[PDB]
Write a protein that binds this ligand. Structure first.
Ligand SMILES: *[C@@H]1O[C@H](CO)[C@@H](O[C@@H]2O[C@H](CO)[C@@H](O[C@@H]3O[C@H](CO)[C@@H](O)[C@H](O)[C@@H]3O)[C@H](O)[C@H]2NC(C)=O)[C@H](O)[C@H]1NC(C)=O
Ligand SMILES: *[C@@H]1O[C@H](CO)[C@@H](O[C@@H]2O[C@H](CO)[C@@H](O[C@@H]3O[C@H](CO)[C@@H](O)[C@H](O)[C@@H]3O)[C@H](O)[C@H]2NC(C)=O)[C@H](O)[C@H]1NC(C)=O
Ligand SMILES: *[C@@H]1O[C@H](CO)[C@@H](O[C@@H]2O[C@H](CO)[C@@H](O)[C@H](O)[C@H]2NC(C)=O)[C@H](O)[C@H]1NC(C)=O
Ligand SMILES: *[C@@H]1O[C@H](CO)[C@@H](O[C@@H]2O[C@H](CO)[C@@H](O)[C@H](O)[C@H]2NC(C)=O)[C@H](O)[C@H]1NC(C)=O
Ligand SMILES: *[C@@H]1O[C@H](CO)[C@@H](O[C@@H]2O[C@H](CO)[C@@H](O)[C@H](O)[C@H]2NC(C)=O)[C@H](O)[C@H]1NC(C)=O
Ligand SMILES: *[C@@H]1O[C@H](CO)[C@@H](O[C@@H]2O[C@H](CO)[C@@H](O)[C@H](O)[C@H]2NC(C)=O)[C@H](O)[C@H]1NC(C)=O
Ligand SMILES: *[C@@H]1O[C@H](CO)[C@@H](O[C@@H]2O[C@H](CO)[C@@H](O)[C@H](O)[C@H]2NC(C)=O)[C@H](O)[C@H]1NC(C)=O
Ligand SMILES: *[C@@H]1O[C@H](CO)[C@@H](O[C@@H]2O[C@H](CO)[C@@H](O)[C@H](O)[C@H]2NC(C)=O)[C@H](O)[C@H]1NC(C)=O
Ligand SMILES: *[C@@H]1O[C@H](CO)[C@@H](O[C@@H]2O[C@H](CO)[C@@H](O)[C@H](O)[C@H]2NC(C)=O)[C@H](O)[C@H]1NC(C)=O
Ligand SMILES: *[C@@H]1O[C@H](CO)[C@@H](O[C@@H]2O[C@H](CO)[C@@H](O)[C@H](O)[C@H]2NC(C)=O)[C@H](O)[C@H]1NC(C)=O
Ligand SMILES: *[C@@H]1O[C@H](CO)[C@@H](O)[C@H](O)[C@H]1NC(C)=O
Ligand SMILES: *[C@@H]1O[C@H](CO)[C@@H](O)[C@H](O)[C@H]1NC(C)=O
Ligand SMILES: *[C@@H]1O[C@H](CO)[C@@H](O)[C@H](O)[C@H]1NC(C)=O
Ligand SMILES: *[C@@H]1O[C@H](CO)[C@@H](O)[C@H](O)[C@H]1NC(C)=O
Ligand SMILES: *[C@@H]1O[C@H](CO)[C@@H](O)[C@H](O)[C@H]1NC(C)=O
Ligand SMILES: *[C@@H]1O[C@H](CO)[C@@H](O)[C@H](O)[C@H]1NC(C)=O
Lengths: 755, 755
């Protein structure tokens, strides 16, 4: 490229060239676009319209994106006739967020994907779809709904999609559709008619559909109780009328969604023919009485995922969960969700149908306000991977502008504690104190989350006695009193400990704070105690023979390292195996001398972000012989080191983002062959001399940032002007963020576009 | 006064003159102090020492305050000999926070009160107390404790206080006292030995005390479990050893405090002789098993207040509250607190001993984590005034620098809902939905608090059916969906409604927001719906024939009153009886024309604080014929009205605090005889002309503020300089906050001290 402000990606193996112009505020398409490009990104900008001459010389383009070019902004985008006939190699085209009134014409016959979401097209005719006979995926959803109203019901002519023999995916979500557009082509695989106003389903609606795999019917007669979004309930709260002989022709169906349908009964005739169903969704319905029967579960032997979340009755508080005995027929069931089934007490015998599920891995029972729940009843679920004990009140026992995948399945929140094995997420529960008898018969638990429980306890090394094999423990948003150094001593196999958000007891001054409790932890690897506001510590030093990562952000290290107080200088000296430090946001105005001498010898990741370092010394960096990722972002530094080579011999990831540096030394990067990453963006730098930025050092630099700063473009930086437009150093936002302060008419000028 | 920077209060009936110099940063005592003053305030300042010449000419002084003159600051205050012998009329003297090492000598014999708190006096001798033979109240507490350590145990010589026949009140709190200073004088009435290190009590400790009324013994062997403050538990967790024949000589005792004593048993012999006890404190103890017996309650027939808060056992979760049958003997009991008695289920039969308490008014049961509690069991407690249903997890049924009083009793939080009658404070409970059957047999409830319950419900006028006589309802920190206008229709006798902190449902756009639900409320008086962030409303106008006070702060009124949208202009027009408006913090950049025309005709209290009004019109104020308390504080106004008389004919409390006004009009206060209150502090005003501030209008002004601004003291304001030092207008901080910007050496000069 010559002056292209967009990133260019080259794939020789795939023979694809990617140009990304996302968030560039380009009024018009820039010139000099290579003809060998394949994917073109033309997202949110100030483009007035589309001209045929825009792609006149581009014949190898295979993907054009026009997502959200005008979010309801000037008038709607107008497309000239024959503006796409010259792209014979076009295969995919996106036109979302263009406020189009009708489907554009003149599309090439080689097109396979077409997106028209967030538009004003409420009429479908076969004349406009005749040219799309070779299309495969069609996206016409979000055309008329609460966010983008049109006051016109969706109208589709008869057999509009019948001629589309190559159609495979069709989406009509949030389009105010009342009647299914019969007749859909027999080659359809995925159907997305959810979030519509369909009230009845005909027996011949899916008569010719035999290769369908995904069917969505959400939003039809939805449950509007406690709905945070606008919705229109059906008359008399009638459920979605679906005939018994509806899913008869479907044989390859795998995913069926019926979320938010206000269903009351599920006849077994629906699943008589679909014997290959994998994922079934029935959330936000009135199937509370159907769960007690669950007669339809006998016809789903290959079901993988079953969803029955939020099926609670109005003004009804069940005494206990009513699980039908038919749940044992789900041999292949893996993930089960019974959320929103609010009940008082959970007993062991209520989970008997799930005892024989060998393939069951995840059992979701959160948001149920369970009061009494014996934790010893989970000893039979050793094969279970994730057990949900969420925000419910279980107490201890007494005495679309972005994205490109469009229609995609929901991705479960992959917590960091799931990869360690069995997980008992007891977060945000009503537990206020921990007993060893409560966690009995739970030696197989490899994870335990207790965030938000607000437990006020002074552990001395006996609470988690049965948790012999526990490796990950979370105690965030609690009140832990570190009055004894024997805490977590019985956790012999513990690896990661989280005691963050425990500022309540740590804010008080004068009480004992045993910070050397990590000595007993022989195999501890990571310790997260950030956001604790620790201001005092009884223990002089912290000892750990295996700790590698330590987080100490959002604390008070200024009082610990106050002038004249050298007691806590070598706080991290005994951490021989420590490699990563995260001491940030500690309000450290300055670093007293001697802290670097007390730093761990094996330190490799040091961060000091948002610390407000008024003056940071650099000659003391020679003590750290293994520092490689020193971070000083969002700081108040004002002087760069005279020679970085003499300071550190292994630093390669120095970052000074959001700093205030006006000038650099004449030998800042002299003989610094070990540097790999350099960041100086968001600064007040004025100029860079040749003797400070040698070409030999810059040749091996992987990434350098000099954007969003106050660089002046005058005659004294001719060397820099020549270098920025003749080097191979990857400088992001080279022609989008970094501008010229002056002088005069040179305001906002591009450095790479200066001659 | 002439140049005194302290407020002067004159009481002809009491013949007392009060001078208050609190927070003045006076290095030395200012001159010109009148000799007729009686009370002198000399609080936190930069006074180096005390000289005898300070009170040489002052002989009528009866009260001298020296509280916190140096908070541990320069060296400790030194008092010259014979510095107080000249004050023959002195009766009270305070010397707290002076870091004194020994008790000052030379005090006049007429002294009656002496305070020496927050000092370093750890030795008590009769030689220093010989001159204090006529003292009545002595305050020597807080001399050695965790905040002000001294590393020396308190030492008191034998019979040190015996010669103090006139002593009545003695305090030794937080003084590291190990042994009670025997022998205390027989005329002592109040004894404060709490928060000490006393481990044993002798049988002759209170042998000669017969007129004692208040006895405090807290902090002796305290319960250090979950203690947010430093504390030293006794050896082997031994309780405070008190003999059975200890309180034998006490006959006039009325208040006895034993909070935080780790007591296990309460023998009845302690209360055998004290038959006139009124208030008893036993909180933070181990009397959980003693509550089940309560044998000592049979000897307290005149007890008024009983405290047993936070007596829970370690690692013990009781199934139910165990109340002894001896509680019926407390005939005169009025306030009872059983907090910190955590148990699972509360039943009606557990409160049987309290059924016969005719004088019982307040029953405290909060912070108990009660799970099951039938609300219908409170129908027998009709005579009860306040019932506590606090942060516990009750769920719906299923199917010292400041202050001068020193030693004072704890003042209960007088909520605004207590004065309305019976109160059921159900705040921060585990209730998530409201049923009419739950509140059955509760027609006598005149108050109901539900703050923090986080209830997500769409009320339609049938939830609070039994609450026919309810007058005050609180629904703060909840999730109320105003989808119907029939909400709170059944509350015929409701007067005040609080629906604040319900921003969850109000933040969503497109859903119905029926703001006209107040029409059904016939006798509604006050409505608080602030901090709701209301941006849209389905109802065009709000109707209420009896509403007088409305709070609408922390909302989004800019979108409602957006330019070109006149639908919500007359939102408050139908509120005929409305008199107070609190529309503040609404991010209103400007006020569109016509809003004042739609204002209620009977509006009298309009507030627009922290609204950021870029330009506020003044000619539209003629519509409001009853405006009297218009507030524009913390705004961004820049132009004062040309003539306030022509704008409003009844405005008398105009406030423009924290504004940005550089100059005033030449006729700002012309013919404004109706003005009473004017505020222009924290502004950028430069000068005031004579024609803008006539003397006739200023004569009737009750209070005027012109402090903390940028007034310049040059030759162009000679009239203002003459007026400020020759007028009777009450201008607070006239010589403390308002200074002179310049010119040159006139920086920081006092306006009243300029000649
Ligand atoms: C133990 O359970 C708690 C409570 O569920 C987990 O904390 C939650 O973690 C998730 C995932 O990181 C957080 O979601 C994220 O939060 C922020 C915005 O709030 C942002 O990074 C993402 O958009 C995402 O929504 C969630 O906020 C957080 N909840 C709280 C109350 O902090 C915790 O991660 C669990 N611990 C383990 C070890 O699994
Ligand atoms: C219903 O119960 C709730 C919860 O107890 C009451 O709210 C609480 O009201 C008290 C008294 O005004 C607040 O204390 C005050 O708060 C601030 C500092 O937070 C300050 O003004 C004072 O220093 C004092 O501490 C308390 O914060 C507040 N709690 C919450 C969570 O908002 C409410 O007043 C009760 N309603 C009625 C009608 O009685
Ligand atoms: C560039 O566009 C092409 C299509 O023109 C994209 O290729 C598609 O890749 C997805 C997965 O990402 C496949 O499911 C499709 O079948 C592919 N389509 C074709 C026609 O082969 C390609 O991924 C795009 N590249 C980037 C970087 O976005
Ligand atoms: C979905 O289509 C229906 C078709 O009836 C729309 O309902 C009409 O809305 C207009 C505009 O408010 C009214 O004038 C008509 O009276 C309505 N018709 C009926 C039969 O009620 C509805 O508004 C559309 N929804 C959206 C979100 O656009
Ligand atoms: C759990 O649900 C099942 C299924 O609805 C309930 O069984 C029904 O109970 C009702 C009420 O007694 C009877 O009229 C039906 O005949 C029962 N159906 C069957 C198929 O037996 C069952 O009672 C529920 N259990 C609980 C504890 O509520
Ligand atoms: C952590 O450090 C503390 C001191 O900060 C250690 O506590 C000391 O323990 C020794 C040995 O029993 C006693 O003689 C001292 O009196 C203790 N000091 C204090 C201040 O209590 C504690 O043992 C250390 N913990 C570990 C696991 O090494
Ligand atoms: C001024 O000081 C006098 C004492 O010199 C205060 O009078 C005391 O008032 C309290 C109640 O406030 C009584 O309990 C005392 O008995 C009074 N003492 C005497 C000696 O009469 C008076 O209140 C002070 N005035 C102010 C405004 O603080
Ligand atoms: C209260 O007085 C006791 C008297 O023993 C103090 O305890 C001594 O404290 C010093 C200073 O730390 C130690 O050198 C002594 O050894 C302690 N003596 C004993 C017998 O333990 C205690 O510190 C005082 N408390 C306060 C808050 O000042
Ligand atoms: C409530 O407390 C009382 C008083 O402690 C308990 O009565 C005692 O119970 C124990 C245990 O059975 C007996 O050994 C004692 O003899 C009982 N004392 C008396 C005076 O009768 C009572 O059991 C407790 N109630 C509950 C339900 O725990
Ligand atoms: C509050 O105002 C709403 C409209 O904002 C009123 O609802 C209307 O009620 C009438 C009479 O039943 C209906 O014909 C309208 O269709 C309703 N309008 C809407 C938008 O729903 C409501 O009745 C008013 N409430 C009171 C108590 O006066
Ligand atoms: C929980 O179950 C275990 C195992 O059967 C049993 O020993 C224990 O008593 C139960 N706990 C409760 C509170 O019922
Ligand atoms: C830890 O505390 C528990 C509960 O008080 C106690 O039983 C146990 O003996 C303590 N352990 C040690 C080693 O002090
Ligand atoms: C240091 O931390 C950074 C955080 O971005 C990470 O990328 C890098 O790999 C870490 N280095 C080492 C040596 O662990
Ligand atoms: C509460 O008490 C009332 C009055 O005796 C009774 O009718 C009701 O059933 C009780 N509720 C529960 C949940 O036991
Ligand atoms: C209010 O809602 C309740 C609960 O759904 C219902 O029983 C009642 O009929 C409703 N009342 C009115 C007047 O619509
Ligand atoms: C207006 O409100 C203020 C708030 O300080 C109050 O002092 C004043 O009495 C109120 N005026 C009327 C007429 O109610």
């Amino acid at each position: 490229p010559k002056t292209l402000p967009c990133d260019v990606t080259l794939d020789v193996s795939k023979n694809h060239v990617i140009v990304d112009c996302t968030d560039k505020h380009l009024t018009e398409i820039p010139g000099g676009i290579p003809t060998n490009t394949t994917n073109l990104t033309l997202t949110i900008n100030h483009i007035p319209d589309i001209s045929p001459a825009s792609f006149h010389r581009l014949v190898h383009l295979v993907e054009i994106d026009f997502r959200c070019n005008c979010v309801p902004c000037p008038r709607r985008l107008q497309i000239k006739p024959r503006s796409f006939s010259g792209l014979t190699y076009l295969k995919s085209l996106y036109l979302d967020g263009n406020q189009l009134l009708e489907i554009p014409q003149g599309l090439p016959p080689s097109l396979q994907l077409l997106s028209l979401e967030a538009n004003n097209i409420f009429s479908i005719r076969k004349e406009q779809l005749t040219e799309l006979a070779n299309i495969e995926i069609l996206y016409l959803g979000q055309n008329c709904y609460y966010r983008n109203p049109c006051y016109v019901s969706y109208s589709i002519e008869k057999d509009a999609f019948l001629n589309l023999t190559k159609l495979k995916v069709l989406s009509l979500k949030d389009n105010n559709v009342t009647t299914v557009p019969t007749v859909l082509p027999s080659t359809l695989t995925e159907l997305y008619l959810y979030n519509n106003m369909i009230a009845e389903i005909q027996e011949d609606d899916f008569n010719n559909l035999n290769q369908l795999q995904i069917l969505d019917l959400s939003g039809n007669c939805p449950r509007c109780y406690n709905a945070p979004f606008p919705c229109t309930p059906c008359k008399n709260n009638s459920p979605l009328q679906i005939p018994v002989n509806a899913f008869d022709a479907l044989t390859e169906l795998k995913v069926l969604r019926l979320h938010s349908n206000s269903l009351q009964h599920v006849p077994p005739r629906w699943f008589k023919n679909i014997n290959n169903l994998q994922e079934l969704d029935l959330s936000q319905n009135f199937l509370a009485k159907e769960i007690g029967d669950a007669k339809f579960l006998h016809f789903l032997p290959n079901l993988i995922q079953l969803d029955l979340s939020f099926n609670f009755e109005l003004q009804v508080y069940r005494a206990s969960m009513n699980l039908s005995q038919a749940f044992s027929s789900l041999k292949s069931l893996k993930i089960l969700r019974i959320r929103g089934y609010v009940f008082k007490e959970l007993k062991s015998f209520q989970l008997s149908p799930l005892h024989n599920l060998q393939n069951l891995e995840v059992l979701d029972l959160g948001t149920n306000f369970i009061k009494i729940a014996n934790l010893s009843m989970f000893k039979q679920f050793k094969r279970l991977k994730v057990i949900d004990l969420s925000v419910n009140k279980i107490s201890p026992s007494g005495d679309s502008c972005r994205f490109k995948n469009k229609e995609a399945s929901f991705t479960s929140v992959q917590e960091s504690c799931y990869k360690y094995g069995q997980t008992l997420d007891l977060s945000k529960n009503s537990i206020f104190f921990i007993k060893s008898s409560d966690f009995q018969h739970l030696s197989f638990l490899k994870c335990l989350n207790l965030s938000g429980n607000l437990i006020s306890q002074t552990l001395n090394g006996s609470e988690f006695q049965p948790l012999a094999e526990l490796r990950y423990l979370d105690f965030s948003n609690n009140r832990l009193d570190l009055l004894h150094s024997t805490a977590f001593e019985e956790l012999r196999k513990l690896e990661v400990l989280d005691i963050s958000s425990n500022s309540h007891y740590f804010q008080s001054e004068g009480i004992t704070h045993m910070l050397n409790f990590t000595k007993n932890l022989k195999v501890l690897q990571k310790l997260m105690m950030n956001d604790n506001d620790i201001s005092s510590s009884t223990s002089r030093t912290m000892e750990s023979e295996s700790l590698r990562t330590l987080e100490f952000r959002g604390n008070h290290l200024d009082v610990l390292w106050r002038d004249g107080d050298n007691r806590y200088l070598q706080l991290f000296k005994n951490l021989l195996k420590l490699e990563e430090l995260d001491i940030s946001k500690n309000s450290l105005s300055f670093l007293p001398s001697g802290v670097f001498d007390g730093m761990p010898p094996n330190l490799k990741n040091l961060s000091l972000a948002k610390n407000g370092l008024k003056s940071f010394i650099w000659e003391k960096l020679r003590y750290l012989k293994n520092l490689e990722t020193l971070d000083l972002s969002h700081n108040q530094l004002t002087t760069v080191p005279e020679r970085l080579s003499n300071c550190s011999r292994s630093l390669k990831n120095l970052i000074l983002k959001n700093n205030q540096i006006r000038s650099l030394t004449k030998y800042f990067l002299q003989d610094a062959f070990q540097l790999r990453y350099l960041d100086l963006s968001s600064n007040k730098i004025q100029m860079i001399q040749k003797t400070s930025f040698p070409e030999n050092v810059l040749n091996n630099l992987k990434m350098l940032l000099l954007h969003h700063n106050r660089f002046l473009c005058t005659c004294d930086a001719v060397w820099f002007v020549w270098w920025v437009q003749h080097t191979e150093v990857t400088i992001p936002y080279l022609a989008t963020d970094v501008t010229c302060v002056g002088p005069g008419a040179h305001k906002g000028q591009s450095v790479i576009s200066l001659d």
